[PDB]
Subunit: 455 residues, 4 copies
Amino acid sequence: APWIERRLRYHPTIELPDDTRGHILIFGIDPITRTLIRKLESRNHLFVVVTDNYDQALHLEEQEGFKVVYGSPTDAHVLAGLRVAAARSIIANLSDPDNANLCLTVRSLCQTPIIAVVKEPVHGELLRLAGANQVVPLTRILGRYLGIRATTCGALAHILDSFGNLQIAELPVHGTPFAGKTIGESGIRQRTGLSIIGVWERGSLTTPQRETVLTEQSLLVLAGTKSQLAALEYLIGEAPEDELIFIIGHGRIGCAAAAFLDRKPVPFILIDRQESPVCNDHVVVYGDATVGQTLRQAGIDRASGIIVTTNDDSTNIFLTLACRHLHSHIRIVARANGEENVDQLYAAGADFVVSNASVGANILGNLLEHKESAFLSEGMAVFRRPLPPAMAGKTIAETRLRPLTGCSIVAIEAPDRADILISPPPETILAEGARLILIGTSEQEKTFDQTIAAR
Amino acid sequence: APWIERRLRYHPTIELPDDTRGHILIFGIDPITRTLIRKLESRNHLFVVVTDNYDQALHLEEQEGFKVVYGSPTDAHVLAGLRVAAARSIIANLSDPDNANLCLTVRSLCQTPIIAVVKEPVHGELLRLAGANQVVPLTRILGRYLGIRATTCGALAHILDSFGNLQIAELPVHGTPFAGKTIGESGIRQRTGLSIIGVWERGSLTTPQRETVLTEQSLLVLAGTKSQLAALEYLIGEAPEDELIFIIGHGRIGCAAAAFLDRKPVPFILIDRQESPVCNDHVVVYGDATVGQTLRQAGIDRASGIIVTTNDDSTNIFLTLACRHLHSHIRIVARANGEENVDQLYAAGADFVVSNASVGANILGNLLEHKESAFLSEGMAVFRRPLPPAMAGKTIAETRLRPLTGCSIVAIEAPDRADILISPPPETILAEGARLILIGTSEQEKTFDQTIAAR
Amino acid sequence: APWIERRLRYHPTIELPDDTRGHILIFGIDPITRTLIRKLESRNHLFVVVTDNYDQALHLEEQEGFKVVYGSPTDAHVLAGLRVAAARSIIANLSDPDNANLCLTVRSLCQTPIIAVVKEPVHGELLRLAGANQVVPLTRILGRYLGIRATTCGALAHILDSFGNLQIAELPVHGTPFAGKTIGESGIRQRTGLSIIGVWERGSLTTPQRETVLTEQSLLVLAGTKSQLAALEYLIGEAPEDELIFIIGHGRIGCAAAAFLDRKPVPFILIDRQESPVCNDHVVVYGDATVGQTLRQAGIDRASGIIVTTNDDSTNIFLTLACRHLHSHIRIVARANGEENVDQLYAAGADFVVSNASVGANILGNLLEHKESAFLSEGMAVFRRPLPPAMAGKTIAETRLRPLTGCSIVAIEAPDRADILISPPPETILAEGARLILIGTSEQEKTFDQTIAAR
Amino acid sequence: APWIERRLRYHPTIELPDDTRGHILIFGIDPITRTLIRKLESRNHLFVVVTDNYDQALHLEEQEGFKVVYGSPTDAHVLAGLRVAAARSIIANLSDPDNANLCLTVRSLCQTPIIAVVKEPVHGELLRLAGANQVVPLTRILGRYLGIRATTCGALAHILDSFGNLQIAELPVHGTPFAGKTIGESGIRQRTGLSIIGVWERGSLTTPQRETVLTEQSLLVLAGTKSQLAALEYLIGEAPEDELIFIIGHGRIGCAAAAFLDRKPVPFILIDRQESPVCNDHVVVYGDATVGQTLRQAGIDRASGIIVTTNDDSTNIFLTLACRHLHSHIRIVARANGEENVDQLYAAGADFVVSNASVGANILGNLLEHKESAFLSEGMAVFRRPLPPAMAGKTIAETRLRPLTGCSIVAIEAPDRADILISPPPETILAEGARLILIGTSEQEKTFDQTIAAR
Ligand SMILES: Nc1ncnc2c1ncn2[C@@H]1O[C@H](COP(=O)(O)O)[C@@H](O)[C@H]1O
Ligand SMILES: Nc1ncnc2c1ncn2[C@@H]1O[C@H](COP(=O)(O)O)[C@@H](O)[C@H]1O
Ligand SMILES: Nc1ncnc2c1ncn2[C@@H]1O[C@H](COP(=O)(O)O)[C@@H](O)[C@H]1O
Ligand SMILES: Nc1ncnc2c1ncn2[C@@H]1O[C@H](COP(=O)(O)O)[C@@H](O)[C@H]1O
Ligand SMILES: [Ca+2]
Ligand SMILES: [Ca+2]
Ligand SMILES: [Ca+2]
Ligand SMILES: [Ca+2]
Ligand SMILES: [Zn+2]
Ligand SMILES: [Zn+2]
Ligand SMILES: [Zn+2]
Ligand SMILES: [Zn+2]
């Protein structure tokens, strides 16, 4: 066995057997890709994590879920041994230069798809050029999610502007009037005309029922026109005269959150242990937040909210304990670097925990699992239309919309106050006065109305 | 055999059997904790150290007295492996943030008692909030027991005010007209009106006897009123003018020492290589002290006492030789980080040695072997009542001091020149002018002043 | 048993077996020397790499082409066990100081030929003194080869001045009126009278046919008078103004390129993370090129070309992409250290790539297995003569030049548009109007014309 | 089965056989110490090296001549393990503080001898107190022997002034008129009246004879009067007009050389890269000597001598070469850290070479067996007398000189113009007119003439 075997001097694996197919191979093991493995164990997937650190290989070889290979990720010969042409997907999670090198190298050998994690927003373009076909600015995203949760009140965070008509935004419920209520009694479609595409609750995008009661923690995906969204901003109200978010840590994430807050102009103060060599736009206070007066003197006592974004979890927990114990009114949003700390961050007294490991693994998994659906929608228009009077009663197949307009239907919201139906089967009876959501070419969107009217 | 397994490639124990009850597990092994294990080796309990350092685990594997488990100690899955819920207790000797994390984690799984060693006294509150049943500011204690021994004479050093009630104080008998004299020709009981709880020698509190000779090293434990303690302050005599104390090493222990000396107003000078990343109150003279030209320039020639407080014991020894060579009169107090450097620090000519491990291990070891005896000692007051007129010369168990108000006597004093008895068995005959030293509830002692006068 | 000894505890080879002869040993293993061992695998040369690093020995054992010895290069006993006397030749690729030590130690034992790589051009002399037969300033060569490529246009780069008459020049084609033309169409010889000895294409020296298409990657190797080079210079046209070159990386190679560009007065700018521990002659801008505005604010906007000379390949790949992307018109020469990246650098958008490992291992290759011709080409002349009329139609041997003049024909250039013939065989028939290129001594050169006429 | 233990996982020894006697044990291995074991290999003594570093124990194990033991050198229970009380003697070659700590710890267990290498002259006193019997400032000695050899012509150098009658001093023979002519044909013995005690050559010493030839390499050891040294100094002839010595490397040993050359006021320049953590007394030109400019610009053109005193031999060798080449006249003294580099230093061009390994090992060896000859030698005022008339023609077996005065003759200067006898046996015939160097007391020197003649 390899049982008896591995009690002898250790040697790493260098290459994979020739018949290796449909494996996913990971470059840049960390808590986000470790979570991605664990999470995709419902499928008998094969994960190959590649390390060029001989010492790392040794330790990973005792962990299950995945196979470790040792070798230089940027040498064609190593990649060839990994059977990159035969692989299902490739996850590029290295430094940005190392990723470009990785891409270009594999791209010289095959077209196997690559999802790359980009550490600097502006680098995304470059990783595409190098041949990544999917580029996830994880730290930008993780920042945004901190930014969103941090305000006293919670406003609209824009997600999509589809060709200057239909818009998609999210809305945290916390400061809002809608907190502790049902989706029905909140009166959103009734006051605004907006559609509620869904609800985030635990990285789970749930179809929103009428009876569903939303918490302080609920995040509401919404679609509508710019004007409609405005009507909604009016309803939530305006923020406190003097809110001030205080961001502990100005690493790549803290920087992102800061960059988020600056757009909806929200004042913030930043603490870091270090001048941090990428940012030239944010004025930072230097010190160890862990040290006594550091925080008080930096003026944490004027803050309406705190964002705990240290690369160390023990620290994040500690700062949470401290800020809650000292300033028990302030809203605290904390970053969880590993998923095995998320609970302690709550225990310590955080209001929300952005769980990096989950959020990341979650995005990656979806890009893997829903590859085709994502592709099929690239560059397409999403728009909303009142059902044409002469189509009421009809079934979806009966309207013949795709063959006549090119556009098809992806969601219907019922005429009555009734939950949204996403991905309706073609045998769906189109009700009295429902609104429908349609994906189509943007050119065909411009034209849809004209053809429906023509017939 | 694990003698043959010793010789094959190393693999670390990662968890504990299911049948593992009453074990004592330790987080952050160090001189203090290694000493603890050695000390309570007679009390038949298995000790378990936990490290996330692979190599440390290796080197500790071969060590006797305790076994090693290699795992991230802030992880619930690891903790479960360790069978925390089934442990006797936990020693949390990690960093402060790391302690808070380990704390909140073990609380979400179980209720097992946790003694926490605290790096910064201020953080004491937070770690109780984190879930610690007990919290120990060791450095402040070690910083205290240094300064105590630094003064030429040695004065009152307060341990606790029982809130208006009698108070507990320690007295180093070195520069006192009580040095050399046995208990009685000192006359503390007779001519002051105080009680001698115990005498420390080399880190162990003894039965104070009439014949026991006080030396320089002897440290007394005292109980009495505000005016009773101040009655002995003049009995010591005048502590000579021109009193300045040099402390070498302004780390945490060094800093603690300085701040102690500044409470009972006493001047000192601080020397260190590096600027403290923690302290900002004390002005430090900078330079290596091993080079003698630096100490000289600092005015060490106008000093009455030295405190040697360095991370390295080999240096501490060397500095003690350097001084006893120059100033053969000066009071030198040295700190030993290890226990195996104590005798050499004496041999070099130190007047008292504060053994970091000996002191540390005592404080823990006691909290352990008196766990459900000193835990409800949080908020309790200690008091001394006279012997009742009607209940004179009758048995203690019969007096019914538990089923009257709710009181309990931990020690009793004798009227004649007869030796005191600490924690005595419940069958002894009382006497004439005796004084009872009890512990109780902060509202039961108030009742006793009229309860024993009515019942 | 060779594969079982692999699974036991590691012990390195200390010495070669006594009977070892004719082997090539290498001190200072790196990409260049590793490419060397690959390139000369056609020959059954035995390579032994020596290392004083215990760990480096381990990871090189399981590597093919060469065997590893663990010892101190500069211990006379280590060399003795390495059988240095019996060795074919030695490569010195340590630091200058260690090289010097190595050579002196080696000379202490034997006369075995040493080829030494010289980090510092000025230290060339010192290493020859030390015992080294051949001295290679690889950093300077690589520096020069970047500089040649980096100009907007490409100009003559002198290589040899053989006793003040026949000259040898290099000429990169890229900017010139020859790019895209065949050698024939270029009209060089027609208008110049230069001999085209060669074309470098991909590190490979090719024979110039009249119909080989010169591309932008092509490096002509020319032979001729100073006035003839002067003529070619006139034909290339005037260089364009505002030429300014950005050199990213200012370690040895960048520095070398920079110094090269300084001769033909060519403006440049240097960037580096670090201050140079070696170069006091060069004003340097400071920053990580990788970081965004670093380059912009340094004024890479008005650069005409860019040498990307970092010591890390992924970085240089990243930087080439970045520049090709944001400044597409700007010419880019990039340095590859290690051959597994040359392709990617082209893929990224590099105009030219200079392969340290190729160029290096190539030069070292010729210096090895052309030993008894290389350093016997020391004190030697390269000259050109019209084939003496009488020998037209006679064979080379038939002519008997070597016996008569001591001179060896090395190149025959045929009268008409016909191909140059390099290192022609003795059986070659000499043409009618052919020009000869001969190798001999300066004395032999002088005697030649008389020896031919009078004899 | 030692070749079996070798293939399984490594385990160091942590103690020795319960019956290890007469073993000499070394603390802190380094060149000098590793040489000591080689040098005294002829004597069947067990050498035991002790390191607290693990990897050290690993590598020292596969090395012949000495047994390796892993342990904490300062732990008393480790020392009991080493069986110190039974060892022949102890070499403490740790740092100063560690050395102190060691000494005391062993002094807690036994009365076994200790030779201690000091790093700072001023601390040697502290080490004696600590328990070292013999204390040796190598770095001081080594700096001296470097400065002695650096003078253009070579002057006298004072070893000892014993109370002010007999002076012992050294003389390099390099530039003196005595260079080349045998001890006889220079008449030092004859003209100066000085006792030539020793000639030093290639690190060794034996009895000087008239036929033995003094090369530039030679260093004489002389006993005499202040008038006689003053006579030798005349024979030397004046030092050259303008002379300056450059010292490369202001480390411990470099610094000592500089100090030495201030006694005899000789101008000198110091170069180093780093500031001295120790020396305040010396001005230093800061620069890397290796780099070109550094030396020349620091005015090395006008030097008369150079002392090359770097940590790193390869640097010394390289510098020697560089100097010898630039300055063929200027005399060069170079320091060799390991014996395996000595030969290459001469090869490079060094006029003289000081071998730290030799010089150091000689001293320790002569203190380990002439440990028995340090028992009946030192501290006695070394004095010189002719033979008392009443001892002419009689043996030491008949004279009984030592029990009478208390002095023992360490040198019988032969009757005629005949060679000296050092450490003579007690059966040696004494000749009529003869000089004696006695290392007895000046108790028994001012007593000598009285006692030696009255009986
Ligand atoms: N105690 C602390 N106080 C302030 N900043 C910290 C502390 N610990 C870590 N950091 C910062 O947290 C940031 C983490 O960066 P990133 O992981 O990229 O978001 C770094 O800039 C660290 O300097
Ligand atoms: N020779 C020395 N002179 C002055 N300070 C020192 C020396 N050696 C160590 N230290 C410092 O003494 C401090 C000990 O910290 P603590 O144990 O907390 O008092 C550390 O901060 C060390 O940097
Ligand atoms: N991102 C970067 N930006 C600027 N310079 C760099 C970067 N990375 C490495 N270098 C420098 O490139 C140089 C390469 O050295 P050499 O191999 O001697 O040419 C070194 O001096 C490095 O400090
Ligand atoms: N290239 C160099 N140029 C100048 N000084 C050097 C160089 N290399 C080493 N040194 C110095 O040589 C000294 C050797 O120390 P020691 O062995 O104690 O005499 C050190 O203090 C170094 O700073
Ligand atoms: Ca946790
Ligand atoms: Ca000790
Ligand atoms: Ca590559
Ligand atoms: Ca050598
Ligand atoms: Zn920023
Ligand atoms: Zn302080
Ligand atoms: Zn430069
Ligand atoms: Zn100095």
